[PDB]
Amino acid sequence: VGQFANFVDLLQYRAKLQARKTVFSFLADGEAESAALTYGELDQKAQAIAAFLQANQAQGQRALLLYPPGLEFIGAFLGCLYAGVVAVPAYPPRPNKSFDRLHSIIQDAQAKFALTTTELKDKIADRLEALEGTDFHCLATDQVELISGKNWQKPNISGTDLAFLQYTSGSTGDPKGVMVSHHNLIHNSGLINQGFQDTEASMGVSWLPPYHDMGLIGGILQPIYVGATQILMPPVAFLQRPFRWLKAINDYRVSTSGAPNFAYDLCASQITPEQIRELDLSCWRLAFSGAEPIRAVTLENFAKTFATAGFQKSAFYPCYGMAETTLIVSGGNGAAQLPQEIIVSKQGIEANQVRPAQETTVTLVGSGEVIGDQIVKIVDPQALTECTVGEIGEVWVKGESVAQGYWQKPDLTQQQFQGNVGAETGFLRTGDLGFLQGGELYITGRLKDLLIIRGRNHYPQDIELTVEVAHPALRQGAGAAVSVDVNGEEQLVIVQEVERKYARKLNVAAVAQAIRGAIAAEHQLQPQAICFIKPGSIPKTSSGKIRRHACKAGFLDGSLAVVGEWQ
Numbered sequence: 001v002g003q004f005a006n007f008v009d010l011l012q013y014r015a016k017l018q019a020r021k022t023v024f025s026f027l028a029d030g031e032a033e034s035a036a037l038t039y040g041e042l043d044q045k046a047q048a049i050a051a052f053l054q055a056n057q058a059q060g061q062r063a064l065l066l067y068p069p070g071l072e073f074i075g076a077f078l079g080c081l082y083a084g085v086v087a088v089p090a091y092p093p094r095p096n097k098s099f100d101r102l103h104s105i106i107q108d109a110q111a112k113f114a115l116t117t118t119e120l121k122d123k124i125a126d127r128l129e130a131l132e133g134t135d136f137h138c139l140a141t142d143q144v145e146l147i148s149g150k151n152w153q154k155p156n157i158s159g160t161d162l163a164f165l166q167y168t169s170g171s172t173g174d175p176k177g178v179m180v181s182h183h184n185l186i187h188n189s190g191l192i193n194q195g196f197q198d199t200e201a202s203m204g205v206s207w208l209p210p211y212h213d214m215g216l217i218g219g220i221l222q223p224i225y226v227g228a229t230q231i232l233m234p235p236v237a238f239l240q241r242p243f244r245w246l247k248a249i250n251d252y253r254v255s256t257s258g259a260p261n262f263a264y265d266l267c268a269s270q271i272t273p274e275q276i277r278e279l280d281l282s283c284w285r286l287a288f289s290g291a292e293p294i295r296a297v298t299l300e301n302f303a304k305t306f307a308t309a310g311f312q313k314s315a316f317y318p319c320y321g322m323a324e325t326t327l328i329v330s331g332g333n334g335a336a337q338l339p340q341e342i343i344v345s346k347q348g349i350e351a352n353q354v355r356p357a358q359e360t361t362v363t364l365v366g367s368g369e370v371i372g373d374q375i376v377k378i379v380d381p382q383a384l385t386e387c388t389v390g391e392i393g394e395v396w397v398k399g400e401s402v403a404q405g406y407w408q409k410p411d412l413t414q415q416q417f418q419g420n421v422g423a424e425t426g427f428l429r430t431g432d433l434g435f436l437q438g439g440e441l442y443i444t445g446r447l448k449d450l451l452i453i454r455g456r457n458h459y460p461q462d463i464e465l466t467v468e469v470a471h472p473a474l475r476q477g478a479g480a481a482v483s484v485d486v487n488g489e490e491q492l493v494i495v496q497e498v499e500r501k502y503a504r505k506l507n508v509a510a511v512a513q514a515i516r517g518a519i520a521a522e523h524q525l526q527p528q529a530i531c532f533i534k535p536g537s538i539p540k541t542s543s544g545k546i547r548r549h550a551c552k553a554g555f556l557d558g559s560l561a562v563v564g565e566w567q
C-alpha cells in the first residue's frame, strides 16, 4: 500500500482487496447507525460522481463542496479526486444566513461549480445564480446512477497535481486557499500513520466537521489510507450530548479518536457519573488533541474524570499541524508514557525565553515530536535568524507535506512558503510561535494575534483564560483579548460574551472590576476597555474559532452586539 502515488489508486486497490469491508458508518444522531459504505461501494460511488463531474466539464475546475456531515460529502470529495476536479470543501449554507463567506470562497477560488445535495440545491441554486451569474453551475451529486461510473475516464494523476483547495479557518484574516497536492495527501497520510500506528484492524470514531483539516484528512482519508473502519457522527450530535462520542468509543471498541482541547473539557463537564459507569474506554488506545492549545489542566481533568471508566492518561496523543502542512507536523510523547509537560517562567515566556522561574510559572504541554522526514526550526520572525535552545520564535516547517502555496496569492505565497534562514531555504512560515525542548515541539501561540503592550509580549489566549474565570457572568470560550492604538500606544481591549442568565441583570461595573483585577494580578496589564457582548455574538469562524481581528474591528466600528462597556 505504501507504493501508491495518490488516493485514487489506493482506494481502487482497497476496493478490490477489502471490497466488502465497511469503510464508513454514519450515525446521523450520534447513536443509531443510519448509513454505511463499504470500500466497494465508496469506490463505485466515487467513479459515478467522477463521471457525472467529467461530463459536466468540471475537470480542471474548482468546485465548492456543500454538504451536511454524512456520506454524500465523502463520495463527492473522492469523486472530485477521481474526476480531476479541484474540490473546495466548505461549511454548507445554513437557513437565514447570508452567503457572504461562501461567495468569498467562490470568488477567491474562482470556482465555476458547487457540489451539493438535492435538498440544498433547491434552496440555494437560485441564490447562487444571483451572486455568481448564469455561468456558475450548482450540481447535486446524491441522485447520480451508479451505472454512470462506467463512463469514468481515469485521469493521469501525478503527485504534483493539485488535489483540492483547503481554506483556512479565517481566524487571523480572510480564509486563504491552501493548494494541497495529491502528494501532500499521500505523504502526510504516511506521517499520520508513522505516529498513530494504526492498522486494518483499527476502529475509529470521529464527530469532527468533515470540511477541513482534522476531520477531513484525518477523519476521512486516514481510515482509507490504512484500510480501517471509521464511525462518523455530525459535530452537532456531540456538542449537544458529549456522552455520544465516548459511548460510540465504548460500543464499537474504538482504538483511535481525538478532538480539540475544548472537546475534552466538554466531556469532563457534561457527562454524568452514571453515564461514566456505562463506559469501558480500555480499548481507546490513542486519544489525539490538536487544532488548539493543549492545556495541562484539561488533560488531567479528563484523565481523572474517566479513570474509573478505564481511560488511561497515556492514551493522549498531542499533535500539531495546519492546512499549509496538509495536516500533521508533530505528534506523540516520544519515549514518555504521558504527554510531556514543562513548568517554566511566565515572565520568561513574555520575553521569548524558556527557562525555570528564578516570579510565576506556567505549565506548557508539548505538541509532540516532529514526525518522519520533515524539518522544523525555530526562527526569529523579524531578523530571520535561527533561535538557539531556550529561545521562542516562529515555527518554520520544511518537508514534502508542505502544500504548494496559496491559491492566486503569489506575493503571500513567496513570502510565507520561501522561508530563508542562515544557509537554509524553502521553509514554510507557520505564523505560530513556539520552541523545541526535549525533542518535542511546544506551541505558544499565533504571531499575528500576539499582544505587544508596554514593551512586553502577551498571548491573547492566556489573558482570555484569565477573563473567563474572573466572574460567573462571563461565558467560557467566548472572549477576545485585542490591542488597540491609543495615541500611538497599544492598549488592551477586552471583548467578552456574557451568559444569557446574566445578560438581563448584569452589573457592568462589578464584573469589569473583577476582570481588571484578574488581568492586573496575572499579567500586569490594565485594559483600556471591556466590551460585554451578547451570548452567541462574538465573530467566529465557521469552525467556531474566535476571529480576534474582527472583535477589534467590531469594537472600533461599533458593530458588536453590546450589552455593557467599561472605559
Ligand SMILES: CCCCCCCCCCCCCCCCCC(=O)OP(=O)(O)OC[C@H]1O[C@@H](n2cnc3c(N)ncnc32)[C@H](O)[C@@H]1O
Pocket (backbone or CB within 6 Å): 168, 169, 192, 196, 198, 202, 203, 204, 213, 214, 217, 218, 219, 222, 223, 226, 228, 229, 230, 256, 258, 288, 289, 290, 291, 292, 293, 294, 318, 319, 320, 321, 322, 323, 324, 327, 328, 329, 367, 430, 431, 432, 443, 445, 446
Ligand atoms: C481508524 C483510523 C482513524 C484514524 C484517524 C486519524 C486522525 C489523524 C488526524 C489528527 C492529526 C491532527 C494534527 C493537528 C492539526 C491541527 C489542524 C489545524 O489546526 O488546522 P488549521 O485550521 O489550519 O489551524 C492552524 C492553526 O491551529 C493552531 N494549532 C493547531 N494545533 C495546535 C496545537 N497542538 N497547539 C496549539 N495550537 C495549535 C495553530 O495556531 C495552527 O496554525
Ligand SMILES: [Mg+2]
Pocket (backbone or CB within 6 Å): 168, 322, 431
Ligand atoms: Mg493559518
